Amino acid sequence: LSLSTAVKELVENSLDAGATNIDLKLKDYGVDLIEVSDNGCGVEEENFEGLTLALSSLCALSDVTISTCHASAKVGTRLMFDHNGKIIQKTPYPRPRGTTVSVQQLFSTLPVRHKEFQRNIKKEYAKMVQVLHAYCIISAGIRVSCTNQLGQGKRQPVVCTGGSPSIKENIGSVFGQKQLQSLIPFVQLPPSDSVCEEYGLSCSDALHNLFYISGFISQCTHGVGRSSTDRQFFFINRRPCDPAKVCRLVNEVYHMYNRHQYPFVVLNISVDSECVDEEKLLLAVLKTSLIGMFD
Amino acid sequence: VLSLSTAVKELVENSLDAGATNIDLKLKDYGVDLIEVSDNGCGVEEENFEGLTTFGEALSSLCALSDVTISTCHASAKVGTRLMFDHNGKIIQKTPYPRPRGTTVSVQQLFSTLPVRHKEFQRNIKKEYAKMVQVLHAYCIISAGIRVSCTNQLGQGKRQPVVCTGGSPSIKENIGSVFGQKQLQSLIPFVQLPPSDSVCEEYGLSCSDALHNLFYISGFISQCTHGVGRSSTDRQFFFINRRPCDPAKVCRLVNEVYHMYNRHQYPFVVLNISVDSECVDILLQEEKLLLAVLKTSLIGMFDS
């Protein structure tokens, strides 16, 4: 559990509640406050007790306050929790439909981790930004935002998507239109014979292809790439992940055309549940498709 | 009055009237290139798409002066719609557009069809932009429970934060979001008092004149300490029934009373005057009674 994993869990809870609006509010990069507010279905009053029987772990590590309102409820409710997940306070609370989870002073009950958190805040915040950006990019139709407030300073916007139906416009929201001008869409091709022979694939192995790849990548032109892999986002069935062999292959094929730079990557891999726990076939489709794009 | 601030003011008020709890302003080149307001209010039903078309109503005027694109989705709609308009307000394109409930209005190249006004806009962009920021700050302060955010982008550079509220329930917390917690440390809450006899005699008010008092004033003001005030009136926000305005005599009076204790500085002011809507025309019935309450209350706060 880290700042990034705490944010990942709260974002996923909002997504599962069916939110179209998700606001991440940070104070001191999240050392002081991590707050996720959404307009999802909210929580019914009957299930208030069972919320901490992910959330239970956060209660053990921080001061957690939750406001929620179910559509079947007239008014919302405000809940305070002790570190055993027990409800300290339960009061009516006027708020729109949805849920707000407030994580105050993460790791305060564990002074060693709290200190490592503060000492390493730049790296932990950068990791959290990666998680935030991945969800911003892939969550078409959902407005995702983040703000941060440092010390006595004013609250500052960090990122905000517009609820657009395309990953491309979400990329533009996150990184600006300049980033889009250097990208090409992924174009899927059947795996060629040489690449199949390279991965030891028969004609029968490639005939039952059920991988659907989409997304965007930097053009391989000399100079238009990036200095590092700071903007590489991989998804399997829309969920952010880090596939080693796939990521390895994408960088390898790109360096065949631009050895001194790294590409921007947004790549979603859609596949049937039977193939989830034929990676060779996937890598064959990827290399063949990228070669066709870069030639 | 055609300006950046009034154009932004009307789109923000449109989002507020639609019941938005999130309003995001994206600006490019201080608004010369793009003014885009995105909200999660009720959106627009398809039956009123034709009828969609002070800033000299808002959208119809904006179409004549800019390139207006709107995406919207009403809760009664299955899918959203994206609309492009010509300068007569006629729909160029109407296509299905999956998006969450609410509306996004994009105003591209404001005043481009009026080259003389467009150049004056560009030449005076710093004053036009500062004026708009002041208006935006006023709505940020008073719109408790609503997350308002704004960014500005110059050329291909990164987006720059302008202002951002956190959806807090109090005007006080919005002030902290807009200006930082340091600004709050020098403020005292307004404490309303009945008008004293001397102030009544100063305004020529009888006991009967003040008996029907229906003004309710609240907000914050700088402490009158000789150093904690401000160098100018750059942060003075007045509201009547939560709507930002500039009442001359009230503003004059507030500054006058503060200078009785701090003659060399000007105060930070956030002041809402709550009153029956029948008594408003800025023209305020029984304005003398209001001014007396103000002076009496401010004197009571600053004494100690």
Curated annotation (Swiss-Prot), chain B:
ATP binds at residues 14, 39, 57-59. One of its GO terms (biological process) is positive regulation of isotype switching to IgA isotypes. Its main location: nucleus. The keyword Nucleotide-binding applies. Changing residue 130 to T: In LYNCH4; uncertain significance. Changing residue 153 to P: In MMRCS4 and LYNCH4; uncertain significance; normal DNA mismatch repair activity. GO terms for molecular function: ATP binding; ATP hydrolysis activity; ATP-dependent DNA damage sensor activity; DNA binding; endonuclease activity; single base insertion or deletion binding. Changing residue 255 to K: In MMRCS4; uncertain significance; decreased DNA mismatch repair activity. It is found in: Nucleus. Changing residue 15 to N: In LYNCH4; strongly decreased DNA mismatch repair activity. Keywords: ATP-binding, Disease variant, DNA damage, DNA repair, DNA-binding, Endonuclease, Hereditary nonpolyposis colorectal cancer, Hydrolase, Nuclease, Nucleotide-binding, Nucleus, Phosphoprotein, Tumor suppressor. GO terms for cellular component: cytosol; MutLalpha complex; nucleoplasm; nucleus. Transmembrane segments: none annotated. Changing residue 10 to A: Decreased DNA mismatch repair activity; loss of ATPase activity. Belongs to the DNA mismatch repair MutL/HexB family. Heterodimer of PMS2 and MLH1 (MutL alpha); this interaction is required for the stability of both partners. Forms a ternary complex with MutS alpha (MSH2-MSH6) or MutS beta (MSH2-MSH3). Part of the BRCA1-associated genome surveillance complex (BASC), which contains BRCA1, MSH2, MSH6, MLH1, ATM, BLM, PMS2 and the RAD50-MRE11-NBS1 protein complex. This association could be a dynamic process changing throughout the cell cycle and within subnuclear domains. Interacts with MTMR15/FAN1. Component of the post-replicative DNA mismatch repair system (MMR). Heterodimerizes with MLH1 to form MutL alpha. DNA repair is initiated by MutS alpha (MSH2-MSH6) or MutS beta (MSH2-MSH3) binding to a dsDNA mismatch, then MutL alpha is recruited to the heteroduplex. Assembly of the MutL-MutS-heteroduplex ternary complex in presence of RFC and PCNA is sufficient to activate endonuclease activity of PMS2. It introduces single-strand breaks near the mismatch and thus generates new entry points for the exonuclease EXO1 to degrade the strand containing the mismatch. It is linked to Lynch syndrome 4: A form of Lynch syndrome, an autosomal dominant disease associated with marked increase in cancer susceptibility. It is characterized by a familial predisposition to early-onset colorectal carcinoma (CRC) and extra-colonic tumors of the gastrointestinal, urological and female reproductive tracts. Lynch syndrome is reported to be the most common form of inherited colorectal cancer in the Western world. Clinically, it is often divided into two subgroups. This is Mismatch repair endonuclease PMS2. The chain holds residues 32 to 365 of 862 of the full protein.
